[PDB]
Amino acid sequence: PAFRTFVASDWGLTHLVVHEQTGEVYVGAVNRIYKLSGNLTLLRAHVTGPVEDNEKCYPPPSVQSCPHGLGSTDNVNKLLLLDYAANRLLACGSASQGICQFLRLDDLFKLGEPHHRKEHYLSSVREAGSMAGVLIAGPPGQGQAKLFVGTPIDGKSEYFPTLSSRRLMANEEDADMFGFVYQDEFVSSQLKIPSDTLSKFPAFDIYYVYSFRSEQFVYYLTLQLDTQLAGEHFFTSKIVRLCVNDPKFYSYVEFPIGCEQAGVEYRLVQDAYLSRPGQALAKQLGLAEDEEVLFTVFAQGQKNRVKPPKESALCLFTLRAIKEKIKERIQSCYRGEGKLSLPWLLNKELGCINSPLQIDDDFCGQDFNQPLGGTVTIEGTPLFVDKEDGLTAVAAYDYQGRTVVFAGTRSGRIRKILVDLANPSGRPALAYESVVAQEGNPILRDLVLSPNRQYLYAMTEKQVTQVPVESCVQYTSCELCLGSRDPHCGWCVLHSICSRQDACERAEEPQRFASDLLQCVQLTVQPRNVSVTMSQVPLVLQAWNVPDLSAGVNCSFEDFTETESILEDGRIHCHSPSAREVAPITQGQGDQRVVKLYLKSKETGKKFASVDFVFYNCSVHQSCLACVNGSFPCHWCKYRHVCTNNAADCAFLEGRVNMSEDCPQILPSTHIYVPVGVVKPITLAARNLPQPQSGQRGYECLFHIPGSPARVTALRFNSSSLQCQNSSYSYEGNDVSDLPVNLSVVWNGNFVIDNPQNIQAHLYKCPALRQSCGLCLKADPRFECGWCVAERRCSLRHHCPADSPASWMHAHHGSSRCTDPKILKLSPETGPRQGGTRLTITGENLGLRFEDVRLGVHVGKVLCSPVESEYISAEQIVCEIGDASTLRAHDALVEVCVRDCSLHYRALSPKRFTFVTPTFYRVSPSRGPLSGGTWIGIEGSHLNAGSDVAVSIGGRPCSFSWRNSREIRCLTPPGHTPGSAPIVININRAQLSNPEVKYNYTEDPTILRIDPEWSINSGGTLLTVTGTNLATVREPRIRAKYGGIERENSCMVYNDTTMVCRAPSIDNPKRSPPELGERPDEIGFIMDNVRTLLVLNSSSFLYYPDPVLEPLSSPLILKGRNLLPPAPGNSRLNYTVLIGSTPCILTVSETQLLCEAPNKVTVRAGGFEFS
Ligand SMILES: *[C@@H]1O[C@H](CO)[C@@H](O[C@@H]2O[C@H](CO)[C@@H](O[C@@H]3O[C@H](CO[C@H]4O[C@H](CO[C@H]5O[C@H](CO)[C@@H](O)[C@H](O)[C@@H]5O)[C@@H](O)[C@H](O[C@H]5O[C@H](CO)[C@@H](O)[C@H](O)[C@@H]5O)[C@@H]4O)[C@@H](O)[C@H](O[C@H]4O[C@H](CO)[C@@H](O)[C@H](O)[C@@H]4O)[C@@H]3O)[C@H](O)[C@H]2NC(C)=O)[C@H](O)[C@H]1NC(C)=O
Ligand SMILES: *[C@H]1O[C@H](CO)[C@@H](O[C@@H]2O[C@H](CO)[C@@H](O[C@@H]3O[C@H](CO[C@H]4O[C@H](CO[C@H]5O[C@H](CO)[C@@H](O)[C@H](O)[C@@H]5O)[C@@H](O)[C@H](O[C@H]5O[C@H](CO)[C@@H](O)[C@H](O)[C@@H]5O)[C@@H]4O)[C@@H](O)[C@H](O[C@H]4O[C@H](CO)[C@@H](O)[C@H](O)[C@@H]4O)[C@@H]3O)[C@H](O)[C@H]2NC(C)=O)[C@H](O)[C@H]1NC(C)=O
Ligand SMILES: *[C@@H]1O[C@H](CO)[C@@H](O[C@@H]2O[C@H](CO)[C@@H](O[C@@H]3O[C@H](CO[C@H]4O[C@H](CO)[C@@H](O)[C@H](O[C@H]5O[C@H](CO)[C@@H](O)[C@H](O)[C@@H]5O)[C@@H]4O)[C@@H](O)[C@H](O)[C@@H]3O)[C@H](O)[C@H]2NC(C)=O)[C@H](O)[C@H]1NC(C)=O
Ligand SMILES: *[C@@H]1O[C@H](CO)[C@@H](O[C@@H]2O[C@H](CO)[C@@H](O[C@@H]3O[C@H](CO[C@H]4O[C@H](CO)[C@@H](O)[C@H](O[C@H]5O[C@H](CO)[C@@H](O)[C@H](O)[C@@H]5O)[C@@H]4O)[C@@H](O)[C@H](O)[C@@H]3O)[C@H](O)[C@H]2NC(C)=O)[C@H](O)[C@H]1NC(C)=O
Ligand SMILES: *[C@@H]1O[C@H](CO)[C@@H](O[C@@H]2O[C@H](CO)[C@@H](O[C@@H]3O[C@H](CO)[C@@H](O)[C@H](O[C@H]4O[C@H](CO)[C@@H](O)[C@H](O)[C@@H]4O)[C@@H]3O)[C@H](O)[C@H]2NC(C)=O)[C@H](O)[C@H]1NC(C)=O
Ligand SMILES: *[C@@H]1O[C@H](CO)[C@@H](O[C@@H]2O[C@H](CO)[C@@H](O[C@@H]3O[C@H](CO)[C@@H](O)[C@H](O[C@H]4O[C@H](CO)[C@@H](O)[C@H](O)[C@@H]4O)[C@@H]3O)[C@H](O)[C@H]2NC(C)=O)[C@H](O)[C@H]1NC(C)=O
Ligand SMILES: *[C@@H]1O[C@H](CO)[C@@H](O[C@@H]2O[C@H](CO)[C@@H](O[C@@H]3O[C@H](CO)[C@@H](O)[C@H](O)[C@@H]3O)[C@H](O)[C@H]2NC(C)=O)[C@H](O)[C@H]1NC(C)=O
Ligand SMILES: *[C@@H]1O[C@H](CO)[C@@H](O[C@@H]2O[C@H](CO)[C@@H](O[C@@H]3O[C@H](CO)[C@@H](O)[C@H](O)[C@@H]3O)[C@H](O)[C@H]2NC(C)=O)[C@H](O)[C@H]1NC(C)=O
Ligand SMILES: *[C@@H]1O[C@H](CO)[C@@H](O)[C@H](O)[C@H]1NC(C)=O
Ligand SMILES: *[C@@H]1O[C@H](CO)[C@@H](O)[C@H](O)[C@H]1NC(C)=O
């Protein structure tokens, strides 16, 4: 669907209203007033606009000449009011001291526009919507039509009244128009701004936002100025009221109004809307039918009425409660208590006069205690609060009891709120949000429901938009329909659509319309699963929450088929489709097809209720396991080797598989070891192996070796054992010793028996991976592969000659010492004398158990204890060295004795392990910031010793980087308190100290001033920076974030207070700085871990754009644009014009360069060059 819309072709719009009979929509705008159809087609356009005029002029140029210069100005529609009684439209403008227009209702024919007298002028004010009011009428001949109207004044106190009661004559040409209801030389039916109050508070003014007639009164929601809150302007939002039948204007009342949400103040009205609550909200808010209610919108605080805050709150007032606050306040002043308290009106405070009276809601004011104010600000019940997108407008309405609220947003969005405080729920909940002018055109206060209350016309600055109160048809499913909750929506069961009660035919009948999710259609089928091979199966259907279907029903499995059904009890009986029909579906989807079986109602002819219905196909299973041990009833035929639903389709009786444990499958034995190039048989076990039948061949073993696949015929001995015949196997590579290979056991050529455990054959070669005795006896005892002394290589007994009865050696259980251990290399080459070092020895022909190498390892004399977990048998020993303090030697060779220190079974390291004692004497900054992050350079001797290193400053750990013989470099942690700190370095079990070498933590540096407060796009200019403790950071640098890019540049520290910095380049091909200048997203300095200096909140640093230069005894003159920027202070570019290498003395001007020449020319300024 699309939202019906009227676009504002040229100008902004201001007001909208709907005619209660026709549904015609009238639209006030700047310079225009439109009549529109219900669907927002243009019907008629009135020009009201651009008028030659001037605001300063009293009576406008028409009546008297004005000395002030006139110009073509825009006429803003300030107000718009439907006068149904006199078949017309009051269309009050501005820009003529506020003269009012009368347009005829059905064609916009100007009936009248009075502007001779002073009353025909309303206000100079050129602001839209700061005005409001109501039209009230009696029958012709009686007390005639009146207009109550508030407007701002702009300080023109003596020209215009802010609030007035004015006359509406039947003749638009009649001069009496907009004259006051009762005028006297003492009191007139108007209320003026006192001159004394404008002298005191310069630009006090009353802005009227909303207005409505209620019972017998007239209310206004207003904004005023600081008068007990010269200074600055802060506003107070108030309610005003009058009796309709009070020509004297004595009934005037004025209470401050707002509401609070968790200690946050909302005191600025943006809009309101008087309404009903309907049965729902009325009851639990405690009201009678015709009792009224006022929805409102407030912004946070009391700041900036011209441009309010995003923070906004929708509150609520019951009029009975405001009526009680006013009655309570009047029955209080008629007790003589306190003053009237109305700052702007009465400057000197007159007192409350006591008197005996029957104070009623019918009270219309009296002569003494006069116009009066309000002390107790009236608090409202909060409903919904937007924090990211400010509310702008509101409306509400009664729907079948439930109270729907409409809320415009600054974004151009409308919210559809059920108010549920009086309703069961925890608090009033948003139901739905909708889009009007998505780009961010705000919605305006004038937001009216249609007469039929089917739509809601939503006005923006630039477009009117017909938003339906209901569009439930976007909801596809009963479950989503009633899930949205926006109360207009119900599921019209038999039409399978989502819409309102009045739109669902026959909804009034039983179960035909669903309103709570529990009413949703629930369906079940008895035979949920039906086989492809079956046909016309009887199915029973149970359905609940469904109307009387005695109209008739069909079953449609999808848009493929449709079978007739008959009704009995609370059940529906229909048949499955034919095999001829079923397969057209299942073809392609294989294993199974889940299909949504619907019910098609005869009355509607639309599918409404559904179920998961399964069409299973046994035949497509191509193995016993899939067939039986699947999820379905399927039978496997051992002999035909096919899966099917029918027992009889099997070969014969004794070949039917119904149980998964009875399947043809290969069972595992202890691993199948196969040496390459050796004639071997491979016996297998299995279960229920078939006797090959008529015209059927015997068994084979197929080996899936990528290099060569071997086909070897086999013999089936019984239902439980196989054997491939004497053969040898190979693969071409010599790359991997142990290759596991997929084998498939076949019979009758292509029938592959099932392999559940996926049993493999391991093809092993005698080592192409092991040229060391220790490596062979290390590998599987299964391979049978062993080490053969004489050859100096390793192969089976098979492949090695027995010249001695013990010439071929195999690790019996691992009780096999391996001759000639050798050490290749060992890590840490150095270590501390104290020990604790983890020595990492890597050899080739070591022992095969740990408990033999344990006790074997020694470093010269020093006993070394080996580690279990970190020991990799006969390749690697990890060993922990003991205390070597007592050793005389400085360095010693490493020794391993395999089990016994026998003369052939000992290894000695090729180069020797060195003992030292590392020392340190200097640190290369000795100072650094408390936050830390300083690159420290500890100098000493033997610093690269051992395994682990840990540096601790104040007990807190340093982040390590790299190690050297002479240097340790690490990054400092944050210090607890500033000053001297101990440096503790521990290498393994050695903990070395020096109290003469300390580290001094320094108070965090500060940045005060950058001097020039600017630079160009490519940067590179000098910046004279000032602050504190700047010598405590060795390498500080400037940081700047422009757009999505972050960039850095260098600094040179001079004093503890002074620093020269080279400005960061922000060169971005996406954004260029404007001629005016631009602040970066972030600007700061990188100083170790002091992170508060990375981002500068107070900084006003600006970036200007990068010079334009024109090419080809008298002096040189070089012309061009952008030579000098509009920069603060003196600060300008240090230009240098050079010739081959010689610089000149030049005076720089804004368009020209005055170099001096004696007769290849290069101009330089920072990092800029041009020829
Ligand atoms: C439920 O699902 C089943 C199974 O998924 C399915 O039945 C299939 O129906 C379609 C028809 O649309 C068949 O597909 C066509 O096959 C045409 C030729 O079929 C020959 O080859 C068959 C395949 O042999 C394979 O499977 C066996 C066992 O697993 C395996 O050992 C082999 O190595 C091999 O991989 C073979 O089964 C078939 O023999 C059947 O028919 C005879 C006579 O009725 C019967 O006695 C046998 O018992 C057996 O059922 C036959 O020899 C072929 O023309 C065609 O291929 C063309 O089109 C495609 C697509 O456009 C191209 O890609 C291709 O290049 C060709 O141009 C097509 O593939 C399929 O064979 C059936 N499946 C089986 C197992 O028979 C049904 O949809 C469902 N059942 C019902 C009742 O609805
Ligand atoms: C640690 O060292 C740092 C830096 O190394 C040092 O900071 C400077 O200290 C020197 C003195 O040692 C000061 O220089 C003196 O300035 C006297 C006149 O000041 C005027 O001129 C200043 C320099 O102009 C240069 O820089 C500008 C801007 O970069 C540039 O446009 C020019 O082309 C020119 O190269 C100028 O900055 C200064 O403006 C300051 O004051 C204003 C207003 O109060 C303020 O708003 C600014 O923020 C700015 O600070 C002003 O216009 C000058 O008389 C004096 O010359 C005497 O001394 C020399 C050498 O000893 C003698 O030969 C000679 O006979 C004179 O007696 C000298 O040139 C300079 O002011 C300091 N800089 C700053 C930024 O304050 C710190 O003092 C040292 N810190 C500590 C703690 O010891
Ligand atoms: C395929 O569709 C079928 C629709 O028929 C689904 O079958 C139903 O499956 C559920 C469980 O998945 C069963 O519910 C259970 O009922 C148990 C009691 O079972 C007895 O009572 C059954 C009805 O009164 C009766 O059918 C059943 O007899 C069965 O077993 C006999 C012996 O093996 C056999 O000879 C008969 O032919 C028959 O199959 C028992 O006497 C109860 O203990 C459980 O707690 C559970 O509630 C339904 O009973 C099944 N319906 C039928 C008609 O058998 C099936 O789920 C679908 N398959 C898949 C994979 O989804
Ligand atoms: C570890 O580092 C800190 C910080 O860098 C070292 O303290 C600094 O020592 C240097 C020496 O180079 C001082 O500079 C000298 O200051 C002498 C006079 O000091 C007074 O005047 C200072 C500047 O006007 C003033 O800050 C300081 O007051 C400080 O101490 C007060 C009492 O403890 C304290 O309440 C204040 O807040 C303030 O921190 C002195 O009154 C002067 O004779 C020299 O001419 C030279 O300028 C710095 O002032 C010291 N800076 C700081 C921040 O304390 C400390 O010595 C280092 N530790 C070791 C063991 O070396
Ligand atoms: C101005 O606004 C009016 C309404 O404010 C509007 O005119 C209406 O149009 C609707 C359809 O948008 C019409 O309603 C129809 O009523 C007849 C019965 O007389 C039905 O047959 C119609 O049903 C059809 O449409 C259904 C929904 O699309 C289909 O499901 C169905 O199959 C039918 O095809 C439909 O309910 C109606 O005629 C008028 N309203 C009135 C009161 O006459 C119009 O959009 C706007 N016109 C202009 C000129 O701007
Ligand atoms: C509920 O179910 C009933 C029964 O299951 C079902 O009745 C079906 O009605 C249609 C008519 O709408 C029958 O189809 C006809 O059969 C003749 C042969 O006897 C065909 O020649 C016709 O097919 C032509 O028209 C089709 C549609 O335009 C074309 O697709 C086709 O090319 C032909 O030109 C004719 O339609 C059908 O036989 C029965 N079904 C069965 C199983 O007999 C009905 O749809 C449902 N009832 C209601 C009230 O909706
Ligand atoms: C099905 O047939 C299989 C294979 O033909 C039979 O497995 C065989 O079981 C016999 C025991 O009778 C094993 O014989 C043994 O051999 C060793 C020789 O090293 C000998 O020392 C023992 O005295 C014993 O005779 C034989 O290894 C094994 N066959 C193969 C090929 O490994 C099985 O008995 C039959 N199963 C049923 C249920 O009938
Ligand atoms: C040797 O056999 C193994 C195991 O049988 C093969 O590896 C894997 O084979 C399985 C089949 O069981 C594949 O699994 C598949 O996974 C998908 C997941 O989407 C599933 O939909 C299928 O039903 C199936 O189970 C798996 O892809 C495959 N592994 C790899 C990495 O491809 C292996 O292919 C055989 N070796 C050689 C050399 O052929
Ligand atoms: C077969 O079913 C068994 C028992 O339910 C289960 O343990 C196993 O996962 C299934 N195996 C296969 C291969 O489907
Ligand atoms: C081949 O297998 C047969 C039967 O298992 C056996 O008698 C013979 O020893 C095997 N021959 C060789 C060379 O391995």
Numbering used by the authors: 37 to 265, 271 to 1153, 1164 to 1210, 1216 to 1227
Task: Give the original sentences from the paper that presented this experimental model.
Class A plexins (PlxnAs) act as semaphorin receptors and control diverse aspects of nervous system development and plasticity, ranging from axon guidance and neuron migration to synaptic organization. Plexins are large type 1 transmembrane proteins comprising typically ten domains in their extracellular segment, a single membrane spanning region that is predicted to be helical and a conserved, cytoplasmic region that contains a GTPase-activating protein (GAP) domain with a Rho GTPase-binding domain insert. All our PlxnA ectodomain structures show autoinhibitory, intermolecular “head-to-stalk” (domain 1 to domain 4-5) interactions, which are confirmed by biophysical assays, live cell fluorescence microscopy, and cell-based and neuronal growth cone collapse assays. This work reveals a 2-fold role of the PlxnA ectodomains: imposing a pre-signaling autoinhibitory separation for the cytoplasmic domains via intermolecular head-to-stalk interactions and supporting dimerization-based PlxnA activation upon ligand binding.
We determined crystal structures of the full extracellular segments of mouse PlxnA1, PlxnA2, and PlxnA4 from eight crystal forms providing a total of 13 independent structures that range in maximum resolution from 4 to 10 Å. In five out of 13 full extracellular structures all ten domains are resolved whereas in the other eight structures some of the C-terminal domains were not modeled due to fragmentary or absent electron density. The ring is closed only in the 4 Å structure of PlxnA11-10, by interactions between the sema domain and domain IPT5 (domain 9). In all other structures, the plexin extracellular domains associate only via the consecutive domain-domain interactions. The membrane proximal domain IPT6 (domain 10) is positioned perpendicular to the ring formed by domains 1 to 9, and the IPT6 C terminus points away from the plane of the ring. This out-of-the-ring orientation of IPT6 is observed in all five PlxnA ectodomain structures for which the electron density is sufficiently well ordered to allow IPT6 to be resolved. All our PlxnA full ectodomain crystal structures have an intermolecular plexin–plexin interface in common. This interface is formed by blades 1–3 of the sema domain of one plexin molecule and the outer side of domains 4-5 (PSI2-IPT2) from the ring of a second plexin. Superposition of the crystal structure for a full-length PlxnA extracellular segment onto our previously reported Sema6Aecto–PlxnA21-4 complex (Janssen et al., 2010) brings the two IPT6 domains into close proximity. The distances between the two PlxnA ectodomain C-termini in these modeled complexes range from 10 Å to 59 Å for the five PlxnA crystal structures that have all ten domains resolved.
